[PDB]
Design a protein around this ligand. Structure first.
Ligand SMILES: Nc1ncnc2c1ncn2[C@@H]1O[C@H](COP(=O)(O)OP(=O)(O)OP(=O)(O)O)[C@@H](O)[C@H]1O
Ligand SMILES: Nc1nc2c(ncn2[C@@H]2O[C@H](COP(=O)(O)O)[C@@H](O)[C@H]2O)c(=O)[nH]1
Ligand SMILES: [Mn+2]
Ligand SMILES: [Mn+2]
Length: 1095
DNA sequence: TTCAAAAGAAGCGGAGCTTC
């Protein structure tokens, strides 16, 4: 332990003594960090990092010598070098701002003078940077090595941070803003997804700063300094970037968005560089210079990414050997630029891509205000994807002469839910624009004979890309549908693309040609199909046509089907057999495919089925209120309004209701995953309000090109067949909007009751400003809830099965109860340790605990089995990072602002997370992991969670392997996995030790509404104990069903399109039998197996 | 309570209560 003398040798002039027991000023930088045994950063020991690194970046020869490497990235050329010269100059500016800010801090309130006199300002939330200063006459100055190294981290962050930010959804923004998710204003989520919160910006900056400092954290130093010092530096750097206008700070006032909300929230946006800035072609030169092992970089050729040791953002969870093997396999795959698509994108140009695939140039006064907001976000996503792709292309272009011959690898990690996620915001897995330009799929096809198998595969790929639902029809029927499309509507587009593949030119009306030809089939993959078909047409050697066009084997209603197979625990029923067949589990039909099923047996998938069940429940609901005209009229008005604006719901002249599967897709999925009905009602209303906002733009538009237009024709012209027929729709819209906002249903002791809101919609419509706000949105939602969502939920249960709903309920309760205990005991053991740290004279409140202390607290919870293990995957449902444990500020900037809360890795309540964790995890998660590692694992694919892109040469075998992987995952038993963990928990939990709030939480899950109130510790214990028995019985049931199923002849085509089902070769033949006969036969096997064990 | 990542700001004082 001469570590102390080692770190002191490197920073001998930092102020204070490196001893926690010392009397005067103590230096918590030297106490917190040690020199690594193996160098991590090349700036350690450098007296002037900015000068030294700038020198390294000044030429290829110097860079190579600095990095001690023979060759540098070819993208590091003349123009790029000049740009880095300028950025290094800017680094000096950031350093200069930081020095002045420090000088100001020291002078204000005589802090520097007081610090010199011995007041421990270096332990204040705003003074932790005083641990990296040095005495300078009558004042203090930054240690230049630590300062300039941090600035280097700031520069790299500035260059690439936006490229690595998380995507924000409604849930995120609702949590950030404290505004109800259903009541979020238009474009608010968009504004927030665009910027970074304080925590978001500072934590990412702090991470980079600490890595560039290249030291190791002392396990026995308080986290208030190990995390606090680099966070304090990051806050100062962020503040300097605001001063320099590299970052824009926007403090969003929630009170203008909701008068009762008092939150004011900072949003930080990095000023984007020019799209044609040479630095975009190689934005990681600093990182690759400073770090011995850079995280941020592209991987070309045989430079292969390392395999992540721990689950993404769950450092307590190691990736299993099987998971690591899968990660390795996916990281081995070579991706290649498809030159024709890049050239097509380039020739169209960003502006026309936006016009075609985004919203083009917005005319802010031909658009409803809310609609305009939505359009901007649309443009944002496309434009960012476009810019990111071409930055990547510019770097690839430097690697060699032929850009299509440069292999590209991508890093992956395993997420909390067991999915293999490609790292990065804009990569082939996550961005559709990029997916069609950089592909691992490649094949050489013989297309000289349109009767070849190769041509059939080619056709399949084209058809799927052109939005023909290829899994619903046989290959032969598909072919005819594709042919008539190509020779019909698409022909003018194909002609244009033939020309492009000849001369390299597009007509000035290219966007109109594509838009008209494609219509609703328009997508990036559709453009690939047009490109590839036209390339085939002009190909000189059709016998050896090279194309990356792919076929996606995609899971049919994957999540719900997986849940039904994995977590249904009872006897077999005929309804389950029919419904599971909708997802590709065929019993007693050797070699049956999904294409055959859909075309000859059952054209309705699981979502359509639930939709038909919804119509039954809606009819049932009407009957119960048959004589109640106000209620009948209220229901009619809701269905009327949805019919006006939604595609998936249509009503006829006689009130005949017709619904499409699309309206049930999301609600069915999230219902299984524990979503409440109110959230679903909010999403449905949002779909409606979006469409009317859009239709309002149409008003503004049609009114512009014709002032004389009637409001009826201005709003419903496009949708009607006549003048008078249009005022009928307008009258409907007005009647519906009035009755749905002025009157709401409420459930009173089981019965539906209509009440006046007193806040009904009144006034002439102003198309530009028109906004459905607060009280009116809530009204629509309450109507949607009781008259649509609630019948839908009934239909959902009837479709997936009451038995599954029961299993998911037991799973949720068990994992929630366990997470509550983990969280509460963690917090208790923290506040215990803090109470004895108060006895320590060396300890100050704000220092918090050491890592070793937190490790010991975490390890103490091990007997409560926080981890769920399957044998090939590990799940940590309660795992999180929250500010609630420490409940204190970690650091501020030197202006007493940018107050970063102290966040700690700790268990938190699971809520309903247990359901999707296990279902996604042991379902599609396990399938993909199996697909990557199984014998004869498909090569050269791109896996996207429940779908897999396959090159045209291998569609048959890869699809059969995918269906085999499905069958393998269906041998899983996630309830048994949860049971094993929960039973260990039950053996060791002490419910009496829990805080009253924790006990209340558990009572919600373990007890009914009635017997909570005054429940004893013992009551809650017995109830938690009952859930264990429930899980045990479910688990045994699931295990039996899977064994019995494996005995029978099965054809599995859940990963559908190609028509290559996996056959399990079960010996018991259940062909020529109805589902009823099959169910009886399976139940005979079930009982017999149940006796094999009761013995 | 769907899941895949969290997440108010700022004066005064030197933590943490307070007000917007
Ligand atoms: N909004 C969501 N919330 C939670 N999980 C989701 C959500 N969307 C998709 N998933 C998960 O990803 C899976 C794949 O989604 P996908 O878009 O392929 O739809 P799907 O449910 O398979 O239906 P289909 O593919 O037949 O249209 C889902 O089954 C579900 O498990
Ligand atoms: N868990 C989860 N997965 C999603 C969600 N949205 C999309 N996905 C996954 O991402 C896929 C979308 O891929 P793409 O739409 O780019 O073709 C879906 O099929 C599904 O696997 C979501 O909200 N939650
Ligand atoms: Mn799917
Ligand atoms: Mn999919």
């Amino acid at each position: 332990e001469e570590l102390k003398e080692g770190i002191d040798a490197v920073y001998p002039s930092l102020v204070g003594t490196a001893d926690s027991k010392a009397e005067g000023i103590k230096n918590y930088f030297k106490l917190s960090f040690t020199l690594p045994e193996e160098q991590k950063s090349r700036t350690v020991g450098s007296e002037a990092p900015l000068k030294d690194v700038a020198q390294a970046l000044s030429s290829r020869a110097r860079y190579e010598l600095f990095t001690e490497k023979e060759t540098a990235n070819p993208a590091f050329n003349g123009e790029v070098i000049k740009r880095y010269k300028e950025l290094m100059e800017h680094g000096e500016g950031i350093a200069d701002i930081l020095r002045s800010r420090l000088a100001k801090f020291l002078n204000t309130k005589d802090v520097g003078k007081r610090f010199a006199q011995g007041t421990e300002a270096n332990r204040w939330v705003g003074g932790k940077l005083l641990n990296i200063v040095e005495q300078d006459g009558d004042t203090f100055k930054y240690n230049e090595q630590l300062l300039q190294t941090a600035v280097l981290a700031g520069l790299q962050w500035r260059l690439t941070a936006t490229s690595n930010t998380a995507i924000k959804d409604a849930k995120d923004v609702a949590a950030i803003t404290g505004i109800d998710q259903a009541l979020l204003p238009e474009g608010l989520v968009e504004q927030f997804d665009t910027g970074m919160t304080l925590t978001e910006a500072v934590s990412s900056l702090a991470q980079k700063i600490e890595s560039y400092w290249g030291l190791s954290r002392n396990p026995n130093a308080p986290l208030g300094y190990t995390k606090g010092i680099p966070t304090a530096m990051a806050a100062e750097i962020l503040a300097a970037f605001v001063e320099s206008t590299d970052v824009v700070e926007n403090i969003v006032d929630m009170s203008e968005i909701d008068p009762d909300n008092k939150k004011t929230i900072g949003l930080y946006t990095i000023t984007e560089l020019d799209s044609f800035d040479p630095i975009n072609s190689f934005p990681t030169a600093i990182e690759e210079a400073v770090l011995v092992n850079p995280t941020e970089k592209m991987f070309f050729g045989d430079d292969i990414p390392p395999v992540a040791n721990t689950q993404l953002r769950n450092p307590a969870v190691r990736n299993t050997p099987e998971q690591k093997a899968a990660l390795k396999a996916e990281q081995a795959t070579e991706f290649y630029v498809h030159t024709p698509m890049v050239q097509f994108y380039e020739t169209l140009g960003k502006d026309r891509i936006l016009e075609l695939m985004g919203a083009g140039t917005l005319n802010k006064e031909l658009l409803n205000d809310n609609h305009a907001k939505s359009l901007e976000g649309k443009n944002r996503s496309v434009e960012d994807s476009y810019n990111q792709l071409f930055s990547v292309i510019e770097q690839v272009r430097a690697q060699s002469e032929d850009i299509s011959t440069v292999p590209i690898h991508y890093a992956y990690n395993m997420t909390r839910v067991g999915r293999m996620q490609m790292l990065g915001k804009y990569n082939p897995q996550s961005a559709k624009l990029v997916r069609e330009a950089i592909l691992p799929t490649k094949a050489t096809l013989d297309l000289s004979n349109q009767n070849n198998e190769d041509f059939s595969a080619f056709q399949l790929g084209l058809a799927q890309a052109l939005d023909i639902k290829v899994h619903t029809m046989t290959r032969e029927v598909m072919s005819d549908e594709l042919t008539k499309l190509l020779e019909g509507n698409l022909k003018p587009a194909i002609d244009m693309m033939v020309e492009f593949n000849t001369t390299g030119s597009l007509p000035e009306n290219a966007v109109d040609v594509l838009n008209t030809a494609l219509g609703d089939r328009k997508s990036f993959v559709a453009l690939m199909a047009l490109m590839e078909y036209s390339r085939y047409l002009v190909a000189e050697d059709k016998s050896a046509f090279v194309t990356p066009l792919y076929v996606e084997a995609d899971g049919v209603t994957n999540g719900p089907i997986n849940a039904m197979m994995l977590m249904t625990g009872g006897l077999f029923t005929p309804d389950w057999i029919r419904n599971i067949a909708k997802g590709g589990l065929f019993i007693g039909s050797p070699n049956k495919t999904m294409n055959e099923h859909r075309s000859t047996a059952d054209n309705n998938d699981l979502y359509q089925a639930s939709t038909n069940a919804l119509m039954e429940s809606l009819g049932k609901l009407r009957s119960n209120y048959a004589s109640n005209m106000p209620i009948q009229s209220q229901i009619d008005s809701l269905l009327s309004l949805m019919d006006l604006f939604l595609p998936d719901i249509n009503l006829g002249e006689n009130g005949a209701l017709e619904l499409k599967r699309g309206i049930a897709k999301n609600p069915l999925t999230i219902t299984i995953y524990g979503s409440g009905a109110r959230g679903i009602a909010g999403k449905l209303v949002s779909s409606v309000t979006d469409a009317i906002y859009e239709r309002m733009s149409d008003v503004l538009k049609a009114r512009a090109k014709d002032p004389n237009i009637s409001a009826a024709m201005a709003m419903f012209g496009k949708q009607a067949a006549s003048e008078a027929h249009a005022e009928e729709l307008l009258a409907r819209f007005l009647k519906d909007m009035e009755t749905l906002t002025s009157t709401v249903p409420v459930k009173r002791k089981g019965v539906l009751e209509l009440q006046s809101t007193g806040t009904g919609a009144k006034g002439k419509i102003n198309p530009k400003t028109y906004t459905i706000k607060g009280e009116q949105l809530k009204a629509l939602q309450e109507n949607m809830l009781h008259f649509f969502v609630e019948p839908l939920r009934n239909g959902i249960t009837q479709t997936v099965g009451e038995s599954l709903v029961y299993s998911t309920e037991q799973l949720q309760k068990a994992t929630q109860i366990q997470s509550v205990v983990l969280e509460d005991m963690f917090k208790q053991r923290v506040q215990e340790k803090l109470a004895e740290k108060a006895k320590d004279p060396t300890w100050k409140k704000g220092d918090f605990l050491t890592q070793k202390e937190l490790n010991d607290i975490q390890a103490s919870l091990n007997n409560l089995a926080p981890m769920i293990e399957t044998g090939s995957q590990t799940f940590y449902i309660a795992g999180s990072e929250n500010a609630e444990v420490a409940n204190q500020v970690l650091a501020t900037n030197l202006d007493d602002r940018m107050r970063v809360p102290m966040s700690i890795y700790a268990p938190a309540q699971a809520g309903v997370a247990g359901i999707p964790f296990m279902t996604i995890g042991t379902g599609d998660g396990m399938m993909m992991q199996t697909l990557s590692t199984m014998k004869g694992a498909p090569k050269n694919t791109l896996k996207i969670f429940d779908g897999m892109n396959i090159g045209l040469n291998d569609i048959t075998d890869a699809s059969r392997k995918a269906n085999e992987a499905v069958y393998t995952s269906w041998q899983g038993n996630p309830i048994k996995n949860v049971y094993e963990s929960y039973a260990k928990f039950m053996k060791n939990v002490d419910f009496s030790k829990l805080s009253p709030e924790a006990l209340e939480a558990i009572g919600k899950s373990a007890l009914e509404y009635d017997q909570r109130e005054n429940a004893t510790v013992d009551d809650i214990a017995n109830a938690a104990s009952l859930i264990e028995r429930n899980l045990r019985n479910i688990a045994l049931g699931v295990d039996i069903r899977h064994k019995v199923l494996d005995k029978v002849n099965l054809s599995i085509d859940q990963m559908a399109a190609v028509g290559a089902p996996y056959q399990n070769n079960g010996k018991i033949d259940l062909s020529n039998m109805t589902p009823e006969q099959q169910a009886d036969e399976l139940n005979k096997l079930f009982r017999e197996e149940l006796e094999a064990r009761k013995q």
